[PDB]
Amino acid sequence: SGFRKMAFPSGKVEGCMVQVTCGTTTLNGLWLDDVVYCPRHVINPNYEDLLIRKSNHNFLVQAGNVQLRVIGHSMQNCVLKLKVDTANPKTPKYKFVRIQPGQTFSVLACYNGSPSGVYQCAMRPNFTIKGSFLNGSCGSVGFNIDYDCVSFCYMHHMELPTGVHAGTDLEGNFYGPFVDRQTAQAAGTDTTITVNVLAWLYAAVINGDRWFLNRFTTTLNDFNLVAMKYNYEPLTQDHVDILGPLSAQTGIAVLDMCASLKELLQNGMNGRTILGSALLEDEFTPFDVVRQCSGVTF
Amino acid sequence: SGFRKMAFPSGKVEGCMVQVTCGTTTLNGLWLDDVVYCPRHVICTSEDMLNPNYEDLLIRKSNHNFLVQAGNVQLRVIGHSMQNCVLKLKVDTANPKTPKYKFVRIQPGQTFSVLACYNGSPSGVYQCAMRPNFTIKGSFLNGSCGSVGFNIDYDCVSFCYMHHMELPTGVHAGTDLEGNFYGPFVDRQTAQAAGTDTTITVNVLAWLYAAVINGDRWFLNRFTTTLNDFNLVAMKYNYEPLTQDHVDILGPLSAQTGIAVLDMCASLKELLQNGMNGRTILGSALLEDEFTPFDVVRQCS
Ligand SMILES: CNC(=O)CN1Cc2ccc(Cl)cc2[C@H](C(=O)Nc2cncc3ccccc23)C1
Ligand SMILES: CNC(=O)CN1Cc2ccc(Cl)cc2[C@H](C(=O)Nc2cncc3ccccc23)C1
Numbered sequence A: 001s002g003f004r005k006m007a008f009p010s011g012k013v014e015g016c017m018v019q020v021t022c023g024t025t026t027l028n029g030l031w032l033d034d035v036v037y038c039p040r041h042v043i044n045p046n047y048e049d050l051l052i053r054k055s056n057h058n059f060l061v062q063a064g065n066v067q068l069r070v071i072g073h074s075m076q077n078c079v080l081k082l083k084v085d086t087a088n089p090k091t092p093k094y095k096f097v098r099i100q101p102g103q104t105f106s107v108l109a110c111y112n113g114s115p116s117g118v119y120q121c122a123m124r125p126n127f128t129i130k131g132s133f134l135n136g137s138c139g140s141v142g143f144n145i146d147y148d149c150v151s152f153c154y155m156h157h158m159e160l161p162t163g164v165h166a167g168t169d170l171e172g173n174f175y176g177p178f179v180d181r182q183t184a185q186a187a188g189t190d191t192t193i194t195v196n197v198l199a200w201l202y203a204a205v206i207n208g209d210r211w212f213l214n215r216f217t218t219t220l221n222d223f224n225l226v227a228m229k230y231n232y233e234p235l236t237q238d239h240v241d242i243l244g245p246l247s248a249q250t251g252i253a254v255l256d257m258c259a260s261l262k263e264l265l266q267n268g269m270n271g272r273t274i275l276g277s278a279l280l281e282d283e284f285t286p287f288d289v290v291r292q293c294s295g296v297t298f
Numbered sequence B: 001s002g003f004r005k006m007a008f009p010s011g012k013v014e015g016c017m018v019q020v021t022c023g024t025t026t027l028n029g030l031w032l033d034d035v036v037y038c039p040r041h042v043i044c045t046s047e048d049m050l051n052p053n054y055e056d057l058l059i060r061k062s063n064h065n066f067l068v069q070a071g072n073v074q075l076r077v078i079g080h081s082m083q084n085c086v087l088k089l090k091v092d093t094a095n096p097k098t099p100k101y102k103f104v105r106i107q108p109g110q111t112f113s114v115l116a117c118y119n120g121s122p123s124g125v126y127q128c129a130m131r132p133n134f135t136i137k138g139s140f141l142n143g144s145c146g147s148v149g150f151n152i153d154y155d156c157v158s159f160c161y162m163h164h165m166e167l168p169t170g171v172h173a174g175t176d177l178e179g180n181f182y183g184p185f186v187d188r189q190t191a192q193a194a195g196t197d198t199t200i201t202v203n204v205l206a207w208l209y210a211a212v213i214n215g216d217r218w219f220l221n222r223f224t225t226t227l228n229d230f231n232l233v234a235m236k237y238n239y240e241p242l243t244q245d246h247v248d249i250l251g252p253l254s255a256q257t258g259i260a261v262l263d264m265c266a267s268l269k270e271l272l273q274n275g276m277n278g279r280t281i282l283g284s285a286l287l288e289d290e291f292t293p294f295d296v297v298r299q300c301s
């Protein structure tokens, strides 16, 4: 019993965190094999013009108390790739993956190449992450661990004026219509990840919380007409299919659980809580619920 | 900016997790130097749990009855001793991944990270607090026994909790790393229940100061209170009494934000009376109590 916002064990990622310094700027890098990946803003910025003026020795890379020597440098989209002399012996089995909004991941927040904390979070429908970052956190990474393979999905780049965060995948492509520079940019209006709220309602049922269940059902179209009114993401047939295992385990059909959500949106919680929360939680996917309520290890 | 329930990086602890098997029972162990620490109930059967005589069950065991697995390698047990509710298995290999560490006993209200493990394999990490009733509201399934709670301050891992059991309300009970339980609990399947739980007042205040640091002042008011009047009110909401030590501990946050502790107490008194009125504080519709004054300074500064 119990339900917590749980992150993947960060150990395999901690062994990859390095400090990258270029001039006055200091941020984090991800050292995998003989390459260090970091945000290109470490160097209206023309990044080809600023980079062509740099030599290998202008980049100081520190792995613990050891300085790594940069032997080459190249740019791929908004990530700087620093070729180093030493291959990281702690390099885990890994992939670079690009996630979709609604998908969750773990963030190992670092300052000066040192990991300070780990938290779980979701890619919002507006492509931002509601993270906890201070200056110096740039280059911190987001990941999922699947079996023994670390799938790197996020690299932190900047903070938006509303306090939310923006970053790229490990190939340097931003999530969202953001650019790496000081200019007027704002996060779009956010929506609730409906499939995740439903997964969390199924997690509550598994943990013994059933007060919100009702005898009713709904059509997918009627549910979406109500979801659109409450700034909830449209629920698709794929979402319904993905919730199948949870539906079969608890005996509550997805459209039956949708009618409970319809009632919660129109009427509120009435002084009650679900899994110790007075708000409808949307940062646990259907897979996170199955993994936590079944105990999968890495 | 931003405020998250943040756990310590688990790497230094992952390198210590081993699987301990005794007969039919399999649970987790903490391998530090040449010793593996695990719950002593690993020597028990399910029947033994009502009234187990651990000294009697342990005297019948030999070193080779305990199977310890570190990754894909079996460790050889060369000795065994019991210290309170923990079994200490002396092994023939010192863990090369042993970090710099201490065994610390925490007080209620203190927070720590939990690396939840099954079969000696870490599956997840989360943050939690020692509740005033000495339980932890964790997320554990069968096989998680032996999972540990810790804090990492500088390069030193302070082990403060080892998981032993789930109480009937779904909450969890365990011991410090010297085998002394937190609370009036015993490693017996007896009728035991958690005492009435209360809110950790000093932590809610620390979290209100975190919200002020992040730009949220909507809940502040023009009032102050005496410590005694605050406690008379807070007790009616099942909030832990706030002591002068708590007030002293909140001093740095008070000085940083410019809001006196008793002024912030007046805001809390008003929030308990009115509720939030459709509003949130740091993305929460409830008053958060699992961030200490130390956690707030660490995450915001
Ligand atoms: C709010 N940001 C600033 O005033 C300065 N910033 C301007 C800027 C512009 C473009 C790009 Cl790509 C990066 C940055 C830098 C930036 O966003 N880094 C930060 C990252 N995460 C949390 C941060 C909390 C606080 C400060 C800075 C953070 C630095
Ligand atoms: C609810 N517990 C049971 O039915 C069986 N239990 C009885 C018992 C009694 C005393 C002691 Cl010290 C340990 C245990 C064992 C126990 O509590 N382990 C578990 C730990 N954490 C989460 C657990 C979720 C589910 C099951 C078991 C968990 C095993």
Ligand SMILES: [Cl-]
Pocket (backbone or CB within 6 Å): B105, B106, B107, B110
């Ligand atoms: Cl303490």
